[PDB]
Amino acid sequence: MPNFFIDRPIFAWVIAIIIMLAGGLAILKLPVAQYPTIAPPAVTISASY
Amino acid sequence: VLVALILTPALCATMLKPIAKGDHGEGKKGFFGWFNRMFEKSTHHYTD
Amino acid sequence: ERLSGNQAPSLYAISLIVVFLCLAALYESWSIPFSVMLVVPLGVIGAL
Amino acid sequence: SVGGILRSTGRYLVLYLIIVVGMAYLFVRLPSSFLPDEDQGVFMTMVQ
């Protein structure tokens, strides 16, 4: 594999650009936050007398 | 590691300048010349 | 209707780029992929 | 026949640009939609 891409630098460049392109498109549609969901979920029962 | 096996070797084959036998950057001019002499000297110290 | 619209030119623009890149890898040439990609209008004209 | 076309070269590049302008014209003329209304064998009538 190393020898393969030594003689074929355009193939090597193509793989990189496709990875960079896919990453660029990801950055547009990814959510943004301080943290992910890290708190455990809670359910509250409320009642009145 | 995938970049180092695919892209990095392809760039080393094409876009690197030749370095002649013996040259370890010791005859460079300015700060880099000092650094290479210092480092090659420190490598000898380290190995010993 | 208001939540987004006219997003096909964006996805087909990248589709052209990725086809150019795949062809470029196939032949090992930045130029040769154009000889394939110039046949796209030959199919579209008959459809229309 | 193809051998004769390659001697011309530049004449078919002009003919190609006619096909692309024809393609461009027919694409803008042709009005778009999503999916055709099919004859499903049933329909309804409102009375208000």
Ligand SMILES: CCCCCCCCCCCCO[C@@H]1O[C@H](CO)[C@@H](O[C@H]2O[C@H](CO)[C@@H](O)[C@H](O)[C@H]2O)[C@H](O)[C@H]1O
């Ligand atoms: C065998 C090859 C597989 C390689 C896998 C690695 C590549 C990953 C895909 C390309 C990443 C970039 O493209 C990214 O893809 C994910 C797919 O979950 C999209 O995420 C999508 O999730 C769901 C479908 O699962 C959709 O309802 C949603 O509209 C969309 O956001 C991102 O919006 C997009 O930006």
Ligand SMILES: CCCCCCCCCCCCO[C@@H]1O[C@H](CO)[C@@H](O[C@H]2O[C@H](CO)[C@@H](O)[C@H](O)[C@H]2O)[C@H](O)[C@H]1O
């Ligand atoms: C190589 C250096 C790497 C540096 C990496 C640093 C990345 C940090 C990114 C975090 C902030 C991303 O913030 C994100 O920006 C993109 C635009 O770029 C926004 O994207 C939004 O605007 C663009 C237009 O500008 C619309 O096409 C898109 O549909 C819409 O979702 C996201 O709504 C926002 O959440």
Ligand SMILES: CCCCCCCCCCCCO[C@@H]1O[C@H](CO)[C@@H](O[C@H]2O[C@H](CO)[C@@H](O)[C@H](O)[C@H]2O)[C@H](O)[C@H]1O
């Ligand atoms: C513990 C604190 C850190 C030490 C700070 C005080 C410095 C004490 C001396 C240690 C060496 C410092 O490193 C200093 O780097 C400069 C880089 O321009 C060297 O200078 C080097 O570059 C110049 C610039 O053209 C050349 O002309 C020169 O021949 C070459 O030696 C100095 O020779 C060296 O004195």
Ligand SMILES: CCCCCCCCCCCC
């Ligand atoms: C071996 C070919 C030398 C030319 C390198 C082309 C670099 C393309 C950069 C693309 C940036 C997204």
Ligand SMILES: CCCCCCCC
């Ligand atoms: C030792 C030969 C391996 C070649 C792998 C090439 C596929 C990218």
